[PDB]
Write a structure and sequence with these properties.
The chain has 97 residues and is an all-beta fold. It is 0% helix and 49% strand. The structure holds sodium ion. Its main location: secreted.
Length: 97
């Protein structure tokens, strides 16, 4: 068996074909096992509506998840990604910078 803690990166992106749109992204990479729970947060509250969740694997024991959705951030709101995995004794929260 093998278990690897996921790398977690939170960032925003504007699709070039529609610059006005902004998307909040949580890229969870290189983890194993595949079982996982991931949420985007807005001011500590779970965002129920997340339009995209793309899962893939490279080696049979390495998974990747891109979890993102459109959003409209303001200088007053705080965004983050919360991840729960067997390798994390406590859920890991990575804030969006
Ligand atoms: Na855990």
């Amino acid at each position: 068996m093998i278990q690897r803690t996921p790398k977690i990166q939170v960032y925003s992106r504007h699709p070039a074909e529609n610059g006005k749109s902004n998307f909040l992204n949580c890229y969870v990479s290189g983890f194993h096992p595949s079982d996982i729970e991931v949420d985007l947060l807005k001011n500590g509250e779970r965002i129920e509506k997340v339009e995209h969740s793309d899962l893939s694997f490279s080696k049979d024991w390495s998974f990747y998840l891109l979890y993102y959705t459109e959003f409209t951030p303001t200088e007053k709101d705080e965004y983050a990604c919360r991840v729960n995995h067997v390798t994390l004794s406590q859920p890991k929260i990575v804030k969006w910078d």
